[PDB]
C-alpha cells in the first residue's frame with residue numbers, strides 16, 4: 071500500500087512538473103485547475119498548498135526572471151509543498167489503518183483514497199490527463215509505440231508460434247532468425263519442462279521478449295526485421 | 305506624425321499579441337510586465353487597460369478553455385483595449401498640438417511622446433524587445449537573413465561594380481549572369497544618363513535589387529549564385 | 539582537532555525528516571541530476587548496452603557511501619563518533635549525508651567523460667594564454683586546469699545567492715580539494731573551487747571548523763567509494779561489452795606484480811574461481827557465463843574493498859579529525875589498495891584504450907573545442923568592453939546560452955571581466971549533455987558558414 075501510494079504521488083506530482091517544464095501549461099494554469107476543481111474547493115490540504123504557493127509566487131515574481139524560469143521556480147516550490155503534504159497524509163492514513171492492514175480481512179483499496187490528500191491527488195491526475203496525457207507529442211508517441219510493438223510482435227510470432235505445440239510453420243529462415251534474435255535467457259526458459267501449456271509457453275516467450283526491450287532497441291529491431299521480412303511477407 | 309504613431313502602436317501591440325500567440329510568453333506575463341514597469345506605475349492609461357483586462361480575464365477563466373485558448377482570448381481583449389486607448393490618446397495629442405504641427409518651426413519628434421499613452425507604448429516595446437525580439441527563433445532568423453543578404457550582395461557586387469565607372473572587372477560570365485538576373489526595371493534606371501555619380505549609380509542599383517526581393521526569392525537567388533560561383537570564387 | 543558537531547552542521551547557508559535527509563531529497567529531484575543520465579561516463583551510450591552513465595555511476599557511488607554510513611552509524615558509532623551532541627541523530631544523518639555527497643559528486647562534470655575536462659582545459663590553455671597580460675594571474679588556472687568538482691560546487695551554491703540550499707555539512711563534504719588555484723600547497727595538486735566561490739567556501743569553513751588544506755572526513759569516504767565504483771564497475775562494463783573475458787581479468791589480477799601475495803586479491807580470486815567452476819556446469823552461452831562470473835566478482839570485490847575502506851577509515855579516524863592530516867586517499871591506507879590499483883590498470887589497458895572509447899574521446903574533443911570556439915566568438919569582450927561580439931552570429935550564440943548562466947555573468951561583482959567571460963563559457967559548456975552539445979555544435983556550424991570566411 072505504501073509503495074502504491076508513493077507511485078501515485080510520484081505520477082501525479084512529477085507528471086504535472088514535467089508538463090509545466092515542457093511548456094504544455096503554466097504554473098498559474100495548474101493553480102487555477104486545482105482551485106476550480108470541484109472536490110478541491112473545500113479540501114483542506116489543497117487549499118493549504120494553494121495558499122502557500124500563492125505566497126511564494128508573490129515573492130518569486132519580484133526578481134527578474136524569464137517566464138519559463140518563474141514557471142520552473144514556482145513549479146519546484148509547488149512540487150515540494152505538494153509532495154510533503156501528500157506524504158504526510160499517506161503516513162497518517164497508514165498509521166491510522168495499520169490494524170486493518172495487518173488483518174487478513176482487509177478491504178482498503180489504496181492508501182491515497184483513505185487519506186486526506188485524495189482530493190489533491192485526484193485533481194493532479196485530472197490535470198495531468200487533460201494537459202499532458204492528451205498532448206500532441208504524447209499521443210504521437212503512443213501511436214508510434216503501438217505501431218512498433220504490434221509490428222514487432224507479429225514478426226516475432228512468425229518465428230515463435232508452433233515451436234512448443236509441435237507445428238513446423240516456424241521452421242523458415244525468417245523464423246529461425248527472429249528466434250535467434252530473442253535474448254538467450256528467455257529462450258532457455260522457453261525450452262524447459264514444466265506443466266505450462268505449449269501455447270502458454272510461446273505466448274510467455276513473446277511477452278518476455280517484448281517487455282524487456284527499450285524504446286530504441288525495439289525500434290531498431292522492428293526496422294531490421296521489417297527490412298528482412300520483405301520476401302516472406304509477399 | 306499620425307502615420308508614424310499608428311505604425312508604433314501596431315508594432316508594440318501586435319508584436320505583443322504575436323509573442324503571446326507563439327507561446328513565448330503568457331498574458332499574465334504581459335500583465336505583470338506592464339504592472340511592474342517603472343513608468344507604467346501610476347499611469348492612467350496603463351492602469352485603465354490593466355484593470356479592464358484583469359476583469360475580462362477573470363470572467364473568461366470560468367469558461368473551460370485550453371491554456372492557449374484562454375491566452376488567445378485574453379490577449380485579443382487586451383489588444384482591443386490597448387489599441388483603443390492608444391488611438392484615442394494619439395487623436396487627442398494631434399488635436400491639441402495641431403497649431404504647432406501647422407507651423408514651420410515644429411519641434412515635435414513624435415505624436416506618441418506628446419500623448420497620454422506614451423508610457424504604455426514604451427512598456428509594450430520593452431516587453432517585445434525582452435520576450436519577442438531577443439527570442440532564439442528571431443535571433444536565428446536575423447542571423448540567417450544577414451548571412452543571405454551579405455552573401456548575395458557580394459555576389460551581385462561582383463557583377464555590378466565598374467559598370468558605370470568604366471572599369472571592366474564585371475565583364476565575366478558570372479558577372480554578366482548576375483547582372484542579367486537583376487530586375488529589368490532597375491537595370492533600365494541604372495543605365496539612364498543623369499547627374500548621379502557612377503559609384504552612386506552602382507550602389508543604388510545594388511540597393512534597389514536587394515530591397516525589392518522577398519525572403520524566399522532572396523534565399524533561392526543566393527543558393528543559385530552560390531552554386532554557380534564555385535569556379536570563379538577560387 | 540575537529541569536532542563532529544561542526545562537521546555535521548545541519549544549518550543551511552541561506553539565512554532564516556532531518557535537514558541532511560532533505561539535502562539528498564533535493565539533490566535527487568534537481569534537474570542536473572536528471573541531465574546526468576545523458577552524459578557519458580566512460581563508454582559511448584548504445585541502444586542495447588547497459589553501460590554506466592553519469593547518473594547510474596552517481597547512484598552506485600551514493601549507494602556505496604550510504605552503506606558505509608550505515609556501517610559507521612549502526613556498528614562503529616563508539617569507535618568513530620565520540621563526543622557528539624545527543625541532538626544529532628547519527629543513524630539518520632551520516633548515511634543520508636554520505637548518500638547525498640555521493641549522488642552529487644559528478645553533477646558539474648562536462649560531457650564526453652574525462653576527455654570533456656581535458657578538452658576544456660586544452661581549449662582554455664590555448665585561448666587564454668598564460669603569457670598574455672590579460673591572463674597571467676593564477677585565477678585563470680581555474681579554467682586552464684578546469685575541474686569538475688569546482689563546477690559542481692558552483693552549481694550547488696550559485697545556481698537557481700544560493701542554489702539547492704544544502705546544509706553546511708554537505709557543502710563541506712563536497713569540497714574534494716580544500717584549496718584554490720591561487721593557493722599553492724603540496725598536499726593537493728588540484729583546486730577544489732573557483733575564485734567566484736572563494737567567499738562561499740570561506741563561509742563553509744567558518745561553519746564547519748575546517749580550513750584551507752583541511753578536508754572533511756567524509757570526503758575521503760566519498761572519494762574511496764568513487765574509486766571503488768570506477769575500478770570495479772568499469773571492469774564489469776569491459777567484460778559485458780565483450781572487450782575482455784572474465785578469465786582475462788582473473789589472469790590480469792593473478793599476474794599483477796602487487797596483487798601477488800596480497801590477501802584481499804587472493805581471497806577474491808579464490809572465491810571467484812570456485813564460483814566460476816560451479817557455474818561452468820550449467821549450460822550457458824559464453825556471454826552468459828562471463829556475465830554471471832563478472833557479477834559474482836563484482837559482488838566479492840565490492841564487499842572486500844568496502845570492508846577495507848571501512849577498516850582504514852575507522853583506524854585513521856583520529857588523524858582525519860586532526861587539522862594536520864597528511865592522508866591523501868582512503869584506499870592507499872587500506873588493505874584493498876593493491877586490488878584497486880590492479881583493477882584500474884586492467885581498465886586502462888582493456889577499456890580506456892579500446893578503439894571505441896578512443897573514438898568517443900576524439901569526437902568529444904572535436905565537438906567541445908569547436909563549440910567553445912563558436913561560443914567564444916559571441917562571449918569574448920562582453921564584459922571587458924570591446925565590441926567584437928556585437929554581430930548577428932555573436933548575438934545568436936549568446937542567446938543560445940542558458941538564461942541562468944547569462945544572468946550570473948551580467949551580475950556586478952568583483953570578478954575580473956575576462957574571468958567572468960571565461961566562467962560564462964565554462965558554465966555553458968559544462969552543463970550540456972553529449973547529444974545537446976552535438977546538436978548545438980551542428981547548428982552553430984551550419985549558421986557560421988558566412989562569418990567564418
Ligand SMILES: [Mg+2]
Pocket residue numbers: 077
Ligand atoms: Mg511507477
Ligand SMILES: [Mg+2]
Pocket residue numbers: 311
Ligand atoms: Mg511599419
Ligand SMILES: [Mg+2]
Pocket residue numbers: 595599643644764
Ligand atoms: Mg565518480
